Ligand binder design. Structure first.
Ligand SMILES: CO[C@@]1(NC(=O)[C@@H](C)C(=O)O)C(=O)N2C(C(=O)O)=C(C)CO[C@@H]21
Ligand SMILES: CO[C@@]1(NC(=O)[C@@H](C)C(=O)O)C(=O)N2C(C(=O)O)=C(C)CO[C@@H]21
Ligand SMILES: CO[C@@]1(NC(=O)[C@@H](C)C(=O)O)C(=O)N2C(C(=O)O)=C(C)CO[C@@H]21
Ligand SMILES: CO[C@@]1(NC(=O)[C@@H](C)C(=O)O)C(=O)N2C(C(=O)O)=C(C)CO[C@@H]21
Ligand SMILES: [Zn+2]
Ligand SMILES: [Zn+2]
Ligand SMILES: [Zn+2]
Ligand SMILES: [Zn+2]
Ligand SMILES: [Zn+2]
Ligand SMILES: [Zn+2]
Ligand SMILES: [Zn+2]
Ligand SMILES: [Zn+2]
Lengths: 264, 264, 264, 264
């Protein structure tokens, strides 16, 4: 009766379905897969990547960047929603091959520094190659790259270092306010009385309020289905998208229903 | 006209005035200096150290531990109020010579991991030897060592990872509630509109409320004068001590007066 | 045509076949599996663990330590042959649950710090949870725990930080010289002209000489079959064991034959 | 009788005497001070910095880079001779302000990661702000930036991670072979029987041989006086420079004389 074999982190095939760059605004592009968001922001002094997807998407991300005429040495900064394997996967590899820097909060940095191991909820089930954060950022801090300002809004819950990012792009000269909000889901989390996360419910609730007040004309999420995006239909991909008010309100209903039946 | 020489971190002589162990409760001992708190908690399965003082206090701390009959290999865990050079100084050296582990929150851990460099307010002026946190702890988490439970209460302000520690000791069988609260001071901090700490005032204000609600019969602070302790007078050292309500209220008045004249 | 799924590191079932502690000398015990070595050395002031095996062996190792009456807080130090997933697997978990310290050379430490990712030969195929080395040790340095002295002998090759450990135990008062030598194999390695390891052949050759001159009356290896141990047969497990001279000489023949046909 | 105050690392004033860029070859420039070498190599795809000097030279280095028309975001890579405070001082600050990457061997990386603390010979006397290495390089590995190839040659001694760097520049179309060799000095080191560095003498001796065989038409050292450079006299600065054979031979004589009188 030998000990069990290691099991790999296997996801849906749509999460790994490569797609060509889809334009969101004048400078923002979706370069991930059909069901996993990876945002590229092209500026005058370099490019910014927000999330990367699964660990095996590093090559694909570099291909799409090459399609936009962004050389590896042109990727200046990597930003994260939260340091889980399905969003921060290729960060370590992308750092070795692009010469980019990684800005994250303290909670995301320590999790990224241990490759997602010892997760508060998942343990060691979803390990990815570890990467080191180069710059610790605080709640409400401003990151500027080539004239575009990225504001961090801490929204703890899914992970302690969950972050929503907001910046103002243009839609052919028309200023658009874009908010990239993190996941508000608690898949399988023990919500009440979790010894690894005592103030979990208080963090989630305040985070629901933080997403509602985001300056946002167009919302995006690490999973496009969470904000009702559909990357397949190209031009019509943002048609049935959700506001921030709808996003936080629908996520809270699921949280409360889950919180209620957890007591049963 | 050469570039200026490096300058060392020099403190008051009372901060480095060694003192014999002073008993606080049945298991809690003060083993630091006259004006710098270093708390030793002796249990059945090992000892816990809360803060260490200046970097040059490592030898003195080990001497006082030897006086209490605590061998180096008996120090099991090191806890921190905040990872500044005058409180977390000897941590790196104490880890090499005691085989102890260090529990800290994410914000304190990243600061401890870079030896206090790149401080949000002090820059590189107060560098100390870096040490690595072994266990990341969350707000309200419980650390237990030999039957004594240590609860963490996040109180950001002085540093982003400022933590107050509470535990229940005895005073000859009589249960006493001890709270070791961090500094609530902002010495020279730019409070309003600090780009390195945008939500600084909101963190301080909520932290004033957090210290008021601490379960506490006897309060201690990293600087004994802040809670009106006087380690010199031995038995009478806790006579004119302050409550948590008085501590947070007096610190807030100074904060507001400082906040008010900062606008001038 | 989606991107391929992650694959887990799967090994032979004998590598994960738990076994009861098998005594090697008066203080040295084998507490790993049938085909994976994990050595426990019990002293007067604590215990030392050499290697741990696969990542999923942490619980089993703690059980065997409990069988020898070694509490988790009695494990003082963890030593490594090399920081590959099949030998340094449970180190990160064993540190969280035993309060132990990890001594390794610089090369092993950086590899352990990135969880075996970005391997010089294996890439990211064999990732394990990352752990941090607490004490950097040099070639020929002495580690002492409870009167037993452990000498490190650098033997680069399999990994840049490969280390053989030697110490003198007793066999009922009779002093025995034990050498725990690392693997001398290069499974699938590109030997000549490897850009990630330019001086690879020079390191291997000098390492063959280093193992020959080890003070050794009884040799052990991370894979028991490499030194012709057979952990199943209990008392007869060390019968057909190899000397250090035979071990290094047989490994060199395979290296040269592999080096010769690599040119073809 | 209080404990002593911390003391700062104070050097000679010539070590901090800023100087304008002095041209060494078509692409190599000296941008440090009069008695501390900091080499800038300008290529088609970016710039490379070799060493930085004292920690307070970060601003000066960026000024000289601005004089050569090298923006901060144009510094792609930082290379180190050894991670002591007087050569690797501004690395941490230069990483935050240039978006550059740091390549170092394992031994230099761990020392750089702890800010030079716990030195094998100096203890905590010469602490500098810690920085993290982004890419671990092996002995003889090739680093290429914009068509210029940098070869690492490990030469342990002064520190375990001491590295000499060689590359081929031009002197108006004429190919020149430049070797930047590390210090071969052991100032105050205990050479024979040092428990922190057991094989110290063997490392130094083999390192004397490694510097002799360096492909070198023009040698430079972290301290210009060690190779008989004189940065003050501008055009005549490389007049009385030493070969590699002379450099290693003169350093060995001092080592042996020091080794001989250490036995007395
Ligand atoms: C770690 O990755 C996730 N979880 C899993 O893949 C497994 C472990 C599972 O929960 O079944 C996780 O969190 N995600 C999110 C998210 O909203 O972030 C959603 C929607 C669910 O999928 C990924
Ligand atoms: C970094 O150490 C401190 N600051 C200094 O020593 C210098 C830099 C200074 O501010 O003049 C700091 O913070 N302390 C506290 C505290 O309450 O924590 C008090 C009361 C003031 O002294 C120390
Ligand atoms: C990373 O673990 C090893 N390699 C593998 O499991 C796969 C990747 C494989 O090479 O097929 C590795 O090295 N080992 C050794 C050793 O001597 O250390 C031997 C004998 C072969 O197995 C393990
Ligand atoms: C750590 O910096 C050094 N040492 C000191 O500054 C003090 C501590 C001292 O030894 O008196 C050190 O090593 N250097 C070298 C070198 O060759 O690298 C030389 C020539 C001497 O100066 C610097
Ligand atoms: Zn997730
Ligand atoms: Zn997800
Ligand atoms: Zn402080
Ligand atoms: Zn203080
Ligand atoms: Zn291996
Ligand atoms: Zn193996
Ligand atoms: Zn030096
Ligand atoms: Zn020097």
């Amino acid at each position: 009766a030998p000990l069990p074999q290691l099991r790999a982190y296997t996801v849906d095939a749509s999460w790994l379905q490569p797609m060509a760059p889809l334009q969101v605004a004048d400078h923002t592009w979706q370069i991930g897969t059909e069901d996993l968001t990876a945002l590229l922001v092209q500026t005058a002094e370099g490019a910014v990547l927000l999330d990367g997807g699964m660990p095996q998407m590093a090559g694909h991300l570099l291909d799409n960047m090459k399609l936009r005429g962004v050389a590896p040495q042109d990727l200046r900064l990597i930003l994260l929603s939260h340091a889980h394997a399905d969003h921060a996967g290729p960060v370590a590899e992308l750092k070795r091959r692009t010469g980019a820097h990684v800005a994250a909060n303290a909670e995301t940095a320590v999790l990224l520094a241990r490759g997602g191991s010892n997760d508060l909820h998942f343990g060691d089930g979803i390990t990815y190659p570890p990467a080191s954060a180069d710059r610790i950022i605080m709640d409400g801090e401003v990151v500027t790259v080539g004239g575009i300002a990225f504001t961090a809004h801490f929204m703890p819950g899914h992970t302690p270092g969950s972050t929503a990012w907001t910046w103002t792009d243009t839609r052919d000269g028309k200023p658009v306010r874009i908010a990239y909000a993190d996941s508000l889901s608690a898949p399988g989390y023990q919500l009440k009385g979790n010894p690894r996360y005592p103030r979990l419910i208080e963090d989630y609730k305040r985070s629901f309020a933080t997403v509602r007040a985001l300056p946002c004309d167009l919302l995006l999420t690490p999973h496009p289905g969470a904000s009702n995006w559909n990357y397949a239909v190209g031009s019509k991909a943002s048609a049935e998208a959700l506001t921030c008010n709808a996003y936080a309100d629908a996520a809270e209903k699921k949280f409360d229903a889950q919180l209620a039946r957890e007591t049963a």
